[PDB]
């Protein structure tokens, strides 16, 4: 059953997620406004959304027990490689299968396939991301499971350029054993059915969405006209 250290990890991750994820979406009013008629009329708004989301993921990451005790260089490698994947994960909280959209509280901040295509992304790559969101939504994760999964995603010891892979793996294993034990102790059947295995498969799916995005980003931003519509932080994190 769940130890005090495993309960403590969870408590920490919940607190971290709560302070970095406003389920009212009030800050979106400060983004460049959405335009749904440039042709990339949604790129300013969704670039802001991403950049805001990178900030938040970094605030969550810094709270993961042991992350701040890694070297700065390894912290930076882990965040650069995982940032899009944790954006994808955390977005699941607004995603709704009613319409296959991300519903952030109002018609202006509801994002569908079309909106994302007006940010420069092919329907072919957008489709796998919607399918991912559906599969993840179907898991019906407890908040505890959601946050642990975001954390396991960030402290992955296989990301290219990691120097202290063992230290990263020691963290991740503590999160992972916390997750397994939580599903077994607190998640009732049958929702718990192979739930750990399914969650870990989502991380593998996210590697694929990452790789595909990486190439598309490299194309979009290679164009100075598009890069100019991004933010400083997005350029720094995803590259120039």
């Amino acid at each position: 059953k769940l130890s005090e250290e495993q309960q403590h990890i969870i408590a920490i991750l919940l607190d971290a997620h709560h302070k970095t994820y406003d389920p009212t979406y009030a800050d979106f009013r400060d983004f460049r406004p959405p335009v749904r008629m440039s042709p990339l009329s949604m790129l300013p708004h969704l670039a802001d959304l991403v950049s805001y989301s990178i900030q938040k993921v970094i605030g969550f990451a810094k709270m993961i027990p042991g992350f701040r005790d890694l070297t700065s260089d390894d912290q930076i490698v882990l965040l650069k490689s995982s940032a899009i994947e944790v954006i994808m994960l955390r977005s699941n909280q607004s995603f709704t299968m009613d319409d296959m959209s991300w519903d952030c509280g109002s018609q202006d901040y509801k994002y569908d396939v079309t909106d994302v295509s007006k940010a420069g992304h092919t329907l072919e790559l957008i489709e796998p991301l919607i399918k991912f969101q559906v599969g993840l939504k179907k898991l019906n994760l407890h908040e505890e499971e959601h946050v642990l999964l975001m954390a396991i995603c960030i402290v992955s010891p296989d990301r290219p350029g990691v120097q202290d892979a063992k230290l990263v793996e020691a963290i991740q294993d503590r999160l992972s054993n916390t997750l397994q034990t939580y599903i077994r102790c607190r998640h009732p059947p049958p929702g718990s059915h192979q739930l750990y295995a399914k969650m870990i498969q989502k991380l593998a799916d996210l590697r694929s969405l990452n790789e595909e995005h990486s190439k598309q980003y490299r194309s979009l931003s290679f164009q100075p006209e598009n890069s100019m519509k991004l933010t400083p932080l997005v350029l720094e994190v995803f590259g120039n």
Partner: peptide, 11 residues
């Protein structure tokens, strides 16, 4: 190569 902003958000 440098990550001034990401560094600052980690500090």
């Amino acid at each position: 190569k440098n990550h001034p902003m990401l560094m600052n958000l980690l500090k």
